[PDB]
Amino acid sequence: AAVHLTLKKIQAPKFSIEHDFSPSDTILQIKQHLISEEKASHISEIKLLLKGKVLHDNLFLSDLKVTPANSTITVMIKP
Amino acid sequence: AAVHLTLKKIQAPKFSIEHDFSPSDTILQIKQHLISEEKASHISEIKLLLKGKVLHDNLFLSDLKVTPANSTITVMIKP
Amino acid sequence: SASKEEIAALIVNYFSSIVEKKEISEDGADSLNVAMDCISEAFGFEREAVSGILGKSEFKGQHLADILN
Amino acid sequence: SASKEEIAALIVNYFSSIVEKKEISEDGADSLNVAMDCISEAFGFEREAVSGILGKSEFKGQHLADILN
Amino acid sequence: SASKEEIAALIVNYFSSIVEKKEISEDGADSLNVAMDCISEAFGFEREAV
Amino acid sequence: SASKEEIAALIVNYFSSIVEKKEISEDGADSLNVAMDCISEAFGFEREAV
Known part of the structure; x- marks a missing residue:
């Protein structure tokens, strides 16, 4: 059952985008999505956080225990 | 018109007593009352305060702007 | 870098913590209440x-x- | 004498003062909010x-x- | 770690230095002298x- | 009399020493590194x- 995530980048220039992922997707897949959306060029440029926790690539989305449609992943990008 | 004052000593052994004074009485008169009540032997042994202000003997009770019946003078006694 | 007024306010704040949380007898809370009023009066701020x-x-x-120096 | 946890809490408290009082742009408040969550996470307390x-x-x-030394 | 009496005694010491150097008015000193006695009483020692 | 940037830079310096001496976990350090970038941005300087 899909997880509707918001991906919010606060570093100027900010963005906020949305996408449905599977609970069985990994953090790596969310970074791969960001590259598909041309927000970055390589996964190494991207950090993702849930609240103050930096999320490692191997984590499964279901491990985050986010809500089905109300949660936001913070995006840090260093080119 | 009389001022009904409460005179409260917090230093153990505590006391709390009441007396009506005139607005034209002075702070000296209240210390003299305390001696009349055998709470002390000389006015020099007594300090009086209203909230955090130490009251000088020459002050008039009307200068304190206390309420007619709800105010308390703190009493410190050093024998 | 604290001013004497700021230090006095910290001291009042500490005694206030004790009284508010009832960490002292009632007679001791009465004593600190007089002390807090005296400090506030002395340093020119309202409690x-x-x-x-x-x-x-x-x-x-x-x-x-x-x-952090 | 402050522990690193106490120091971290003071820092979070300072940024919280800025955000609560709206003493910063909305985007800057968003950045401090992330920073406060990260500090809290790092030092093991809830914000x-x-x-x-x-x-x-x-x-x-x-x-x-x-x-007072 | 400072005991409650030690904290109270440092506070009394701080106020005594303010009075002794005349950093506030004489009326202010009057009030701080009363404070110091109430603080000593609250924390169970003599000034x-x- | 410390400016807001000066305060922010002292904070960043404090966190950098915690990370560098490994006084919290590697995951903690990850989080503090993100904090430091957000602090630098909030107060208008580069880390x-x-």
Whole structure:
């Protein structure tokens, strides 16, 4: 059952985008999505956080225990 | 018109007593009352305060702007 | 970097913590209440102003800078 | 005498003062909010626990003793 | 770690230095002298003892 | 009299020493590194500048 995530980048220039992922997707897949959306060029440029926790690539989305449609992943990008 | 004052000593052994004074009485008169009540032997042994202000003997009770019946003078006694 | 007024307010704030949390006998709370009024009178602030004084971002930041040197 | 946890809580408290009082742009408040969550996570306390941590008589008294030396 | 009496005694010491250097008015000093006695009482020691 | 940037740079310096001495976990350090970048942004300087 899909997880509707918001991906919010606060570093100027900010963005906020949305996408449905599977609970069985990994953090790596969310970074791969960001590259598909041309927000970055390589996964190494991207950090993702849930609240103050930096999320490692191997984590499964279901491990985050986010809500089905109300949660936001913070995006840090260093080119 | 009389001022009904409460005179409260917090230093153990505590006391709390009441007396009506005139607005034209002075702070000296209240210390003299305390001696009349055998709470002390000389006015020099007594300090009086209203909230955090130490009251000088020459002050008039009307200068304190206390309420007619709800105010308390703190009493410190050093024998 | 704390002013004597700021220090006095910290002292009042400490005694206030004890009285509010009932960490002292009632007679001891009465004594600290007199002490808090006297300090406030001596340093020229209202006892009720203490939270505001210690609550300024400016004070918090400077005190943090003192701590972090 | 402050622990690194107490220092972290002071820092979170300072940024919280800025955000609460709206002393920064909305985008800057968003950045400090992320920063406050990261600090809280790093030092093992909940962000909502900070007031309680700094509010203990014990902390206030020790910090006062540090200040008064 | 400072005991409650030690904290109270440092506070009394701080106020004594403010009065002794005349950093506030004489009326202010009056009030701080009363404070110091109430603080000594609250924390169960004598001011002289500080 | 410390400016807001000065305060922010002292904070960044404090966190950098915690990370560098490994006083919290590697995951903690990850989080503090993100904090430091957000702090630098909030107060209008670059972290390298600190």
